Amino acid sequence: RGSHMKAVQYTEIGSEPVVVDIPTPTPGPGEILLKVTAAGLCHSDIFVMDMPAAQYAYGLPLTLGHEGVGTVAELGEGVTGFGVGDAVAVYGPWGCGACHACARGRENYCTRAADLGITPPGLGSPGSMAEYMIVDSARHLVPIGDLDPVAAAPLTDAGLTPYHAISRVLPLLGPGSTAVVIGVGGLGHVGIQILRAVSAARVIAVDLDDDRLALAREVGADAAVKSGAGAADAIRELTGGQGATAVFDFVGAQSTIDTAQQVVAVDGHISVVGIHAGAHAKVGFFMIPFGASVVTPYWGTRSELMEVVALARAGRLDIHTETFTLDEGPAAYRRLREGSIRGRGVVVP
Amino acid sequence: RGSHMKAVQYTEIGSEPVVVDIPTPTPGPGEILLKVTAAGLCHSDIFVMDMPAAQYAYGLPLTLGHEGVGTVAELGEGVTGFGVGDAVAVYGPWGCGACHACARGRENYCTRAADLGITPPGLGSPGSMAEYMIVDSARHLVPIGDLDPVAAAPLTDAGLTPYHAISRVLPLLGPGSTAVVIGVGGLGHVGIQILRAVSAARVIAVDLDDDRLALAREVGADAAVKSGAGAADAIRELTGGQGATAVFDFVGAQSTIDTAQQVVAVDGHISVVGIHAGAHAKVGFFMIPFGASVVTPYWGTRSELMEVVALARAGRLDIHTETFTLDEGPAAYRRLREGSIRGRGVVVP
Amino acid sequence: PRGSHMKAVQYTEIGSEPVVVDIPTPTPGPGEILLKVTAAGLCHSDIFVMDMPAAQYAYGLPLTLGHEGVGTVAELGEGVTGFGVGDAVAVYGPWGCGACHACARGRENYCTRAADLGITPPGLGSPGSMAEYMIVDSARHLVPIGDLDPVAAAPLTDAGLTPYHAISRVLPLLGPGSTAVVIGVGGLGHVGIQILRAVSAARVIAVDLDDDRLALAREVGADAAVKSGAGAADAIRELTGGQGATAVFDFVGAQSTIDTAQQVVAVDGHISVVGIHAGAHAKVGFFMIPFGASVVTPYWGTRSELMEVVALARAGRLDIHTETFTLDEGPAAYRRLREGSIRGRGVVVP
Amino acid sequence: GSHMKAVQYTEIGSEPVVVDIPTPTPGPGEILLKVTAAGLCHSDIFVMDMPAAQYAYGLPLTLGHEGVGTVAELGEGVTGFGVGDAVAVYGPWGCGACHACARGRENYCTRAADLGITPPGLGSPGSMAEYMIVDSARHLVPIGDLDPVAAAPLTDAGLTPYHAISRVLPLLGPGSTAVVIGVGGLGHVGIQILRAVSAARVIAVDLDDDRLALAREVGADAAVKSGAGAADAIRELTGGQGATAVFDFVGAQSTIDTAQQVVAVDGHISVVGIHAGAHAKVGFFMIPFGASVVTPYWGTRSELMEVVALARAGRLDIHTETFTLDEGPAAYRRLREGSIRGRGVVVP
Numbered sequence A, B: 001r002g003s004h005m006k007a008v009q010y011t012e013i014g015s016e017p018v019v020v021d022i023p024t025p026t027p028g029p030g031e032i033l034l035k036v037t038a039a040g041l042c043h044s045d046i047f048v049m050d051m052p053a054a055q056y057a058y059g060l061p062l063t064l065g066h067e068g069v070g071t072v073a074e075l076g077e078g079v080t081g082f083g084v085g086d087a088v089a090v091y092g093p094w095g096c097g098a099c100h101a102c103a104r105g106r107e108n109y110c111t112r113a114a115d116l117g118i119t120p121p122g123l124g125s126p127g128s129m130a131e132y133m134i135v136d137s138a139r140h141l142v143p144i145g146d147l148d149p150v151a152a153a154p155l156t157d158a159g160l161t162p163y164h165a166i167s168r169v170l171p172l173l174g175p176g177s178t179a180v181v182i183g184v185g186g187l188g189h190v191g192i193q194i195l196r197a198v199s200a201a202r203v204i205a206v207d208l209d210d211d212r213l214a215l216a217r218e219v220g221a222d223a224a225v226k227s228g229a230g231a232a233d234a235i236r237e238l239t240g241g242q243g244a245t246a247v248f249d250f251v252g253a254q255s256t257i258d259t260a261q262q263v264v265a266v267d268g269h270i271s272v273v274g275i276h277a278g279a280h281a282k283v284g285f286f287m288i289p290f291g292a293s294v295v296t297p298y299w300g301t302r303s304e305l306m307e308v309v310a311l312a313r314a315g316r317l318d319i320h321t322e323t324f325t326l327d328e329g330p331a332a333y334r335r336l337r338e339g340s341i342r343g344r345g346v347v348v349p
Numbered sequence C: 001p002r003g004s005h006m007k008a009v010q011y012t013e014i015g016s017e018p019v020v021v022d023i024p025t026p027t028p029g030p031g032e033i034l035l036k037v038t039a040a041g042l043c044h045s046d047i048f049v050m051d052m053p054a055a056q057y058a059y060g061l062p063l064t065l066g067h068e069g070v071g072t073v074a075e076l077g078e079g080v081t082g083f084g085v086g087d088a089v090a091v092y093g094p095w096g097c098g099a100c101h102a103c104a105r106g107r108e109n110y111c112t113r114a115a116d117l118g119i120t121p122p123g124l125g126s127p128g129s130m131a132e133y134m135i136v137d138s139a140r141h142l143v144p145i146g147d148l149d150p151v152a153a154a155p156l157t158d159a160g161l162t163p164y165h166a167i168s169r170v171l172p173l174l175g176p177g178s179t180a181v182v183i184g185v186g187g188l189g190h191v192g193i194q195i196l197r198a199v200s201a202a203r204v205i206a207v208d209l210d211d212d213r214l215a216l217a218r219e220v221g222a223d224a225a226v227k228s229g230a231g232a233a234d235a236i237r238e239l240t241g242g243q244g245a246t247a248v249f250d251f252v253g254a255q256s257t258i259d260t261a262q263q264v265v266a267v268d269g270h271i272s273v274v275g276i277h278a279g280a281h282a283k284v285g286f287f288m289i290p291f292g293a294s295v296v297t298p299y300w301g302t303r304s305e306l307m308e309v310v311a312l313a314r315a316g317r318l319d320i321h322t323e324t325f326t327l328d329e330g331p332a333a334y335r336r337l338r339e340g341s342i343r344g345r346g347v348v349v350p
Numbered sequence D: 001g002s003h004m005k006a007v008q009y010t011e012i013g014s015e016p017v018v019v020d021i022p023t024p025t026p027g028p029g030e031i032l033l034k035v036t037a038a039g040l041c042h043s044d045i046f047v048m049d050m051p052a053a054q055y056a057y058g059l060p061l062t063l064g065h066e067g068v069g070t071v072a073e074l075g076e077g078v079t080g081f082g083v084g085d086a087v088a089v090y091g092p093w094g095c096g097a098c099h100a101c102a103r104g105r106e107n108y109c110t111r112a113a114d115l116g117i118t119p120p121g122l123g124s125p126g127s128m129a130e131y132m133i134v135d136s137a138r139h140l141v142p143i144g145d146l147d148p149v150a151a152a153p154l155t156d157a158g159l160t161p162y163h164a165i166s167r168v169l170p171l172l173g174p175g176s177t178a179v180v181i182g183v184g185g186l187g188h189v190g191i192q193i194l195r196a197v198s199a200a201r202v203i204a205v206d207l208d209d210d211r212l213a214l215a216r217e218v219g220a221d222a223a224v225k226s227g228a229g230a231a232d233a234i235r236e237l238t239g240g241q242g243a244t245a246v247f248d249f250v251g252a253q254s255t256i257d258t259a260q261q262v263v264a265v266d267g268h269i270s271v272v273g274i275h276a277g278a279h280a281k282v283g284f285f286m287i288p289f290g291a292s293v294v295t296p297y298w299g300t301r302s303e304l305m306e307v308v309a310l311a312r313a314g315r316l317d318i319h320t321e322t323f324t325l326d327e328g329p330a331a332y333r334r335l336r337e338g339s340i341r342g343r344g345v346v347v348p
């Protein structure tokens, strides 16, 4: 290959990411080096890059990109289970692999990763927005077969994170139930499709743009209303006043969380997936229906990633993507900031 | 170190185990070498050694011992998570670590281990009944802290196997439920202790031996019944004719399974944990109550082994142990055939 | 078909960008075929047409764009025999009259009556493929593709057929020991290299502007690559020992690249001006070009050539990079094409 | 190989590109080298920024005037080297027969311009290619088992400061002071040279604080920030005496002005760096008495041998970032933005 590789890095606090030529890494024992085939942009990348110097703690420079797919380039010493050339997706939320949470497969909830300094690619470790990347262990590689890399990259976060949020309360979403999806962006437009595939719940979408509402219907939403002060009333108009069994808020604004608490049913669920600084649900007596649980989920488990890949291979996921080159990385992040990307932006080296 | 080590091996079909000298293994990348501190014996070892030569195809010589505990002696290249001297128990039912069952933590139900020739230590792979043993991966080590290795060794099987069987239907064993334990020696004695620690179910002990029944009461059995033809009516007399929510048959004989089907409640459960060749539950309409599920569980999950270790370290699990030296290995196995071991035999190199 | 209305992208008024529209689903008349479009490719020729002033433009509005069509047979017009419903087919672009001497020879792209009769290609006068359904005038303008990926097949109708025809016009000259120069390694050029390696033993030397493009040319099969410009001709002659190139395939078409082609083409060679740059032209006269070096501006390709292009693609000999778009994303995709932000060839998938 | 890859400057205002050209063959007296290391430096950026009128090096140009390699083929009649010998390339080629050349100062050859003799990578084919031609055996300096990547910067980053210092080395005895303006690149090596071949006090001057801290690690006894106050700070460190020698590796008008304000009586100013139009103004009352000024050019062959001896003794330490030949143009972009710490070196 080449001694150097193109990469999109966050180098200075408050500055836009830059395209640089950095050394090509080599896999240590147990590690795997991949030739990246597609790297996705996530709105949480903007959040990280918008943190002040006091809060930012992911080191500089940082190769961005935690939505990674690639082909096995080089196997580290003792790495069996994958051959060179195998198409694989990168399981992002790396854990210690030995705590109680990790042994259950829930590595995203590892209780020792923070103490041990184990961070995901693109969020502390070198990310996938580069020609090559290192993966710490073979257990963080999931085969994708002949899936198109551009549509496979979002599965690692844009599919895995909604899939996990939905899975936490899937038994509540039988026939007759209603699931409200707020935000029809990169995550939400996949979350709608997941709901249609693993449940018989009625899906009501919520967003601000008429194009986002049309996208929601395009991907299986049974109904779509506009976000705002009237969103709660519009939803309850469609449910006959009953209230939604579950509300998946992929925006995370205080106004969207407020709408969630106004429409969630008794014994229901609100999932705050989107990140807005300071926004929070208010879980207290007479401020939220009885028994309606609230949680901020984080990414997903490894088996959930394999299930998401299985959904894609069965044709149940229609991922909307716009392709960029590595040199267009910083330009793509400007596009994502202004909300000009319909769906998920993906960089292809 | 030392170039060679003693090991108790099954060397030819129909023969007794012998203490032989073999090379001390060295850990390759990803592997871990343990200095064995305790190696348990159980009747499953006998069942394997009684396997006929006609059935045999490969596997000799075989170092015995699937109930292994030790201290980390040397780390293979790239291994992280443990240091030299760490006390760890060996997770028995090794799996591929990459299938859906493995990613969920249920390696004992790995769907690829058979095809890939992945076998447990002491049942296809070199076991713990030796001065040193190789463990294929760090994920098959569970820390035990300062727990006595002799007390920890039976937990790898005698504790894990009943704990998994109970765990499969634990949500059914709330207050007001009844759990029947057939065979209160060996694993049943541990099962009773587990049931009192993780559930409020009423426990009914069933066994042939009067002495065993009294000791079952000491560890929590609320009632005792003599196994046999009258066991079913005796059990129904205790439950008021409503049946037992769950029946854990640790004998596995046809007569005890027959008793289980006659006492299991509607929508209950029967777990066939003991193994008697040919014995089987007959699950059909009007031969078993409606909704009463039956299963033959296998060993347990890694996270379950951690929970079993947590119970022991909390003082909730005590298994009587008879200690032998490595040279007494073959003698202990002869003692096991004649049932002369009270408790669980443990070899301490 | 199924549905009286269908989605489409149309060029509706001069100087304005294409728009997504809702228009009626067409019905196949006698001799016609209705296709459910599976892939419709974009190319810069669409930009050139939409950049034509009001006076020059003579292709009729509104115009469903898309002259690189692939789809499945949806309905057979009366009397149409030769295809079954569901058959995957590519759309032959340069429609001709089918009755003149050129058409009878298989060279419909050089039909001498099409202009008089108003016969225009899909997306360049007739309704194109950038819609859920499209009409094809005749069964002879359909080429089967089998199980070939429609997205991979769509560029073959232009990005494959056009370089293939240019090379085929002088293929007998490209024997072992010959040298073929490829100027421009973009959409058509890098397909031209793959074609040259598959159907000839010629040495391929590439010319382009970017270190990235020169590296790509070497990756696709070029033996050597040099930077475009005033020194391009001398750089090529350095690699050939000063002999000159048997054929130069100029896929850029600028005056500078044509000048390079005339400075590097060998005696009795050939220059094919394939790229379009308004006003650019070769100057074929004594002392301005070597003896016997013919120059031509080829147009698209023949139907038998498109069949050969499909055979190459189905055998794994043709690899074209692609990016897919939604029908709604049609106008946005053309914006990308204007700014040159599309790597490879764009394809709309209804 | 009938043809080879080479990083070339092919037209004015354009960026360097990797292009295929014929593999050269050595004529009588010439030597063919398999390149093992080819250094990049800002002088290449300066040459490529030359407008059309000034550039007189001819196109296309294989870049790379900091060349190292192994002898691959000897032209007819070439004795003194064997196939496989590791050698650095002496850059400033001369005629070899004029008075300056006969004294060893080929860099100051008086007939090279009239005869059209140009250095590799600056008029003649450079080293940034798989193979390169060296016109004569006397333009090869053996390096022994020296790492070729470490040898390549010595051909310019070591030779040029070494020559500039050597021109007035007898002045730099104990008690003397040497001011180095511009610590990056050549200046970093100049400081190391000053500590190795002299006992002079070294005052590092630069605009970047991080570069100044690195100067102190290699031997600088004091650090000053370039600017309007640099002259006062330097004279604060030396008292009112001034600096015996000022080696200006930036060459800007401001840095030259600072040099004229701090140089001591009977001292020396060496304008090593190039900024178009910048010049010292040597006149009465505009510079101390007896303070000589010169623009030195590269170095002599014996000086290159001495630089190699310094490197092989562990006295010279240049940080190197290694690039492949295909990454040549990429490495040049990083040099334009000063993103390379130390020196870039291409390894075919």
Ligand SMILES: CC(C)(C)[Si](C)(C)OCCC[n+]1cccc(C(N)=O)c1
Pocket: B044, B045, B047, B048, B066, B123, B157, B161, B272, B273, B274, B275, B296, B297, B298, B299
């Ligand atoms: C694989 C063997 C045939 C050797 Si078995 C399953 C008799 O013992 C292995 C050791 C684990 N263990 C022991 C007893 C019972 C069970 C069970 N209920 O699965 C598991």
Ligand SMILES: CC(C)(C)[Si](C)(C)OCCC[n+]1cccc(C(N)=O)c1
Pocket: C043, C045, C046, C048, C049, C124, C158, C162, C273, C274, C275, C276, C297, C298, C299, C300
């Ligand atoms: C060629 C024309 C200028 C007449 Si136009 C803008 C109608 O091209 C569309 C026909 C497709 N195609 C694309 C590129 C080149 C050629 C070619 N070498 O003819 C043909």
Ligand SMILES: CC(C)(C)[Si](C)(C)OCCC[n+]1cccc(C(N)=O)c1
Pocket: D041, D043, D044, D046, D047, D065, D122, D156, D160, D271, D272, D273, D274, D295, D296, D297, D298
């Ligand atoms: C400035 C020159 C006209 C000599 Si230039 C940009 C053609 O240097 C190339 C020769 C290498 N080098 C680099 C830096 C300085 C010098 C020097 N002061 O001699 C020489």
Ligand SMILES: [Zn+2]
Pocket: A042, A043, A044, A045, A066, A157
């Ligand atoms: Zn994310």
Ligand SMILES: [Zn+2]
Pocket: A095, A096, A097, A098, A099, A100, A101, A102, A107, A109, A110, A111, A112, A113
């Ligand atoms: Zn963990």
Ligand SMILES: [Zn+2]
Pocket: B041, B042, B043, B044, B066, B067, B157, B158
């Ligand atoms: Zn056992």
Ligand SMILES: [Zn+2]
Pocket: B095, B096, B097, B098, B099, B100, B101, B102, B103, B107, B110, B111, B112, B113
């Ligand atoms: Zn498995």
Ligand SMILES: [Zn+2]
Pocket: C042, C043, C044, C045, C067, C068, C158, C159
């Ligand atoms: Zn086209």
Ligand SMILES: [Zn+2]
Pocket: C096, C097, C098, C099, C100, C101, C102, C103, C108, C110, C111, C112, C113, C114
């Ligand atoms: Zn015709």
Ligand SMILES: [Zn+2]
Pocket: D040, D041, D042, D043, D065, D066, D156, D157
């Ligand atoms: Zn230099």
Ligand SMILES: [Zn+2]
Pocket: D094, D095, D096, D097, D098, D099, D100, D101, D106, D109, D110, D111, D112
């Ligand atoms: Zn001379």
